[PDB]
Specification:
The protein is built from 3 helices and 15 strands. It is mainly beta. The strands form 4 sheets. Strands 2, 5, 8, 9, 13, 14 and 15 form a 7-stranded mixed beta sheet that branches. Strands 1-4-10 form a 3-stranded antiparallel beta sheet, with no helix packed on it. It has a 3-stranded mixed beta sheet with strand order 3-11-12, with no helix packed on it. Strand 6 and strand 7 form a beta hairpin. It binds N-[(1-methyl-1H-pyrazol-4-yl)methyl]furan-2-carboxamide (NWV). The site of N-[(1-methyl-1H-pyrazol-4-yl)methyl]furan-2-carboxamide has 7 residues, from strand 13. The site of N-[(1-methyl-1H-pyrazol-4-yl)methyl]furan-2-carboxamide (NWV) has 7 residues, from strand 13.
């Protein structure tokens, strides 16, 4: 059985209990914490690409009102985010299983842009998701996994100073 686990869940949960925020910029900002995933049960000899996307967790716009995040009343359907291909892709199962798979180079933007960067809507809430795609073999297969612990709201600047403090303390 293919097993997907979150590395450093301890720390993600401190961010989540405060409501996590991730900065987006026109050029694209790297994430902290970085999503790092433990994977076991791949075929060491099979070929895989690791893909990352962001599910809109709800259909609403969020605002930080009197020290508290609150959703708008006017949902709109959220078109799915673009997919980020891990730079190590494509690679053997052994490669992916020898150390946590770290998405350190993904950049989150608010503007449709050249390449690499993933465009999110500011003040929407997102749930990171990976796809593990068996490639080059005869039998294409996909395994997907969500990480509720890594939910955040996309912001152009931090609203909750308790987030600002955690980000610095642990970077
Ligand atoms: C780092 N990098 C690798 C590619 C090639 N593409 C892939 O591996 C791919 C696309 C869909 C599933 O897998 C593009 N960027």
């Amino acid at each position: 059985e293919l097993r997907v686990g979150l590395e450093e869940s301890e720390l993600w949960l401190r961010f989540k209990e405060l409501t996590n925020e991730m900065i987006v910029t026109k050029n694209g900002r790297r994430m902290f914490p970085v999503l790092k995933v433990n994977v076991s049960g791949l075929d060491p000899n099979a070929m895989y690409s690791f893909l990352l996307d962001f599910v809109a967790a709800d259909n609403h716009r969020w605002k930080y009102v009197n020290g508290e995040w609150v959703p708008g009343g006017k949902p709109e359907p959220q078109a799915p985010s673009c997919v980020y291909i891990h730079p190590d892709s494509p690679n053997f199962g052994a490669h992916w299983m020898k150390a946590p798979v770290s998405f350190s180079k993904v950049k989150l933007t608010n503007k449709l842009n050249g390449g690499g960067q993933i465009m999110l809507n500011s003040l929407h809430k997102y749930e990171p998701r990976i796809h593990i795609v068996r490639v080059g073999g005869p039998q294409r297969m996909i395994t997907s996994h969500c990480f509720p612990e890594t939910q955040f709201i996309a912001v152009t600047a931090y609203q909750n100073e308790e987030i600002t403090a955690l980000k610095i303390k642990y970077n």
